[PDB]
Design a protein around this nucleic acid. Structure first.
Ligand SMILES: [Mg+2]
Ligand SMILES: [Mg+2]
Ligand SMILES: [Mg+2]
Ligand SMILES: [Mg+2]
Ligand SMILES: [Zn+2]
Lengths: 36, 146, 229, 95
RNA sequence: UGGAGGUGAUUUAAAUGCCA
RNA sequence: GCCCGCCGCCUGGGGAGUACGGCCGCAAGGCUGAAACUUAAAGGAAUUGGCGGGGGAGCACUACAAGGGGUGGAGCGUGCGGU
RNA sequence: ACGGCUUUUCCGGAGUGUAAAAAGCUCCGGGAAUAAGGGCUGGGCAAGGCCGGUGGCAGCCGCCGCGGUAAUACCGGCGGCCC
């Protein structure tokens, strides 16, 4: 997914392992629901 | 890290290709060869414009300031788009009536964009009915069309 | 040149030295500024320079580069103390540069001017440009470089009449030493005058670390110290 | 007599229903049109406004529909004091 | 004088903060 | 560290590893990858202090442990909030 | 404030100039007479620690930043600085 290590730093944001998991759940809908 | 990649005598082509390919990682040169300012720009490469006012509004200043800054909604002529302009001077909002032909400049901030606490305004009125707003605000001249 | 030559005759009495160079000077043995340097001594009494370079205190051979107040926090507020940077030198062949610290501005200035006499050096001058080929001591004899902090400087000779083209706090140091024409090329962050000043000082020092032949001397005009004042 | 924030100039009486958020206050005045008050920066420090506090605001001649602006509050020693004079009828607060 | 690794253990509940 | 070679990548923080289009895979997914717009800082290594439901050393009847007398419940004296 | 002086520029007049004009240039008569604005005045950046308004409002602000009833920073008056 071509990640960049500046974003695991947790200073003023939320965990990256849990943001990726939420980008995926949207790319699953833009694809089923007429991502055809 | 090594020394530097194509430092040969007969290595011109690879050198020119390297430089030409890493020039695009810039942002001022890219924004220029593609001509991206235009076709995203309501004034279309001009230093003024002329519009017709639609209403009068006021905005809130930024976080560590307090006040309301007066402004107007202008609709252009050459395009038909709608921009938000700002009236400079103590008591200017008392001259801009509806249905006026105003002139429009930039505002001169960083990168051509906005400035100061007024965060999203990027144009300022100069002329109202062909009488410099600067004069009107301080007497010294009379206003046409009522 | 008189008032700054009775000054030494006044100082030379009420001064009973404690180091050894003090004895040597006060007994008429050592009698000229050019013979305490290249021999490995130590200099801890600031009256030695008042006697051999009595002009170093003339208020037009003095200079106050920057003043800045710094802070450290404590459970009863902030404790604030100053820092001054000052340079001194006759405008002929000698310079010095020091810092000093205090809790007011006259005391910091006093210590700075003091420690700027115990950090004195002599340089080499000449004329090594490609345009001017006279033999007169107005410029650096050949390009030198000195580094400090995060700031690299490089000083290039320049033709007679062209002024001093360097930053702001380089001009004072290079004017107090006698140089009058120069060019320049720098790097790093040149907004922290402490590091910029120390790099210029180190370059002027490194002037005398380049090997020369006895014939290169009568082609650039290299004078060491005074040159017929 | 007494110094009370009467309607001076063009003031309005603000009695709020709900705070949608970020300072917007839906007010329910005797005028009828849903007005939406906002707040200046001089009082956002020392005072504390909520629902049921009849207070004074100021409207704006633009559309005369969703307007109002706090300038001063009312203390519990005035809110019901303002009944006997009948300057305001409280049945604009129970329907 | 001064540091680098390893294996063990580490104990009921216990949240939140005008304005200058 | 001082030199002689070759190849890969970087150009303020976000938007974004996202949209669109291709090539792989049975599916999960992988590789390639922008612009509108928004913002004056985001980041690094060290220094005084303050703090820790971190560690050591030492304290104190406005702390405890061992003890003596009580205030908190009733009526009045006096001070305060509110009305 | 008194005494004198000049006529580049300004009004009339004569030559010359020009395809014809006009400008221009040489001579005459009057007259110091006909002729300075624009922007800045907290730091970067030369220049005020003065007077009167305004009270987080009005306004200023390329960036940093002023204004909360004692404003060198906003609006004026008087001073000063660069062209
Ligand atoms: Mg990294
Ligand atoms: Mg907490
Ligand atoms: Mg002024
Ligand atoms: Mg200045
Ligand atoms: Zn020379």
């Amino acid at each position: 997914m071509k990640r960049r290590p500046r974003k695991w730093k947790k200073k003023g944001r939320m965990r990256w392992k849990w943001i990726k998991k939420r980008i995926r759940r949207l790319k699953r809908q833009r694809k089923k629901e007429r991502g055809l | 890290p090594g020394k530097k990649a194509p430092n040969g005598e007969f290595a011109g082509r690879k050198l020119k290709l390297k430089r030409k390919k890493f020039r695009w990682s810039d942002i001022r040169y890219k924004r220029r060869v593609l001509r991206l300012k235009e076709k995203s720009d309501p004034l279309e490469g001009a230093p003024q414009a002329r519009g017709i006012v639609l209403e009068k509004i006021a905005v809130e200043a930024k976080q560590p300031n307090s006040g309301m800054r007066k402004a107007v909604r202008v609709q252009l002529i050459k395009n038909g788009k709608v921009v938000t302009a700002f009236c400079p001077g103590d008591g200017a909002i008392k001259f801009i009536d509806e249905h006026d032909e105003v002139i429009i400049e930039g505002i001169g901030g960083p990168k051509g964009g906005s400035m100061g606490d007024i965060p999203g305004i990027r144009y300022k009125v100069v002329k109202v009915n062909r009488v410099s707003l600067k004069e009107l605000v301080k007497g010294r001249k009379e206003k046409p069309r009522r | 040149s008189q008032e700054w030559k009775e000054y030494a005759k006044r100082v030379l009495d009420e001064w009973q030295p404690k180091t050894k160079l003090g004895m040597l000077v006060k007994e008429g043995q050592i009698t000229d500024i050019h013979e305490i340097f290249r021999k490995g001594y130590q200099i801890k009494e600031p009256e030695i320079i008042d006697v051999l370079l009595p002009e170093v205190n003339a208020r037009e051979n003095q200079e106050i580069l920057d003043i800045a107040l710094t802070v450290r926090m404590t459970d009863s507020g902030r404790r604030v103390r100053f820092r001054v940077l000052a340079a001194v030198g006759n405008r002929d062949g000698y310079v010095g540069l020091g810092i000093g610290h205090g809790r007011e501005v006259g005391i910091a200035i006093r210590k700075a001017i003091n420690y700027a006499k115990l950090n004195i050096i002599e340089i080499k001058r000449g004329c090594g440009s490609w345009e001017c080929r006279c033999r007169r001591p107005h410029s650096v004899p050949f390009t030198v470089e000195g580094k400090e902090g995060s700031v690299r400087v490089k000083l290039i000779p320049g033709p007679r009449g062209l002024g001093l083209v360097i930053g702001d706090v380089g001009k004072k140091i290079l004017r107090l030493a006698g140089i009058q024409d120069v060019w320049s090329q720098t790097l790093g962050e040149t907004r922290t005058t402490v590091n910029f000043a120390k790099a210029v000082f180190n370059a002027l020092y490194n002037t005398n670390k380049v090997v020369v032949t006895p014939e290169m001397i009568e082609r650039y005009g290299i004078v060491v110290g005074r040159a017929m004042p | 007599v007494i110094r009370v924030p009467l309607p001076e100039g063009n003031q309005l009486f603000g009695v709020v229903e709900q705070a949608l958020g970020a300072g917007w206050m839906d007010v329910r005045c005797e005028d009828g049109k849903i007005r939406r008050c906002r707040i200046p920066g001089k009082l956002r420090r020392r005072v504390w406004i909520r629902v049921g506090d009849l207070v004074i605001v100021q409207p704006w001649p633009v559309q005369s529909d969703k307007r109002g602006d706090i300038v001063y509050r009312y203390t519990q020693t005035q809110v019901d004091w303002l009944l006997r004079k009948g300057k305001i009828t409280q049945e604009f607060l129970t329907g």
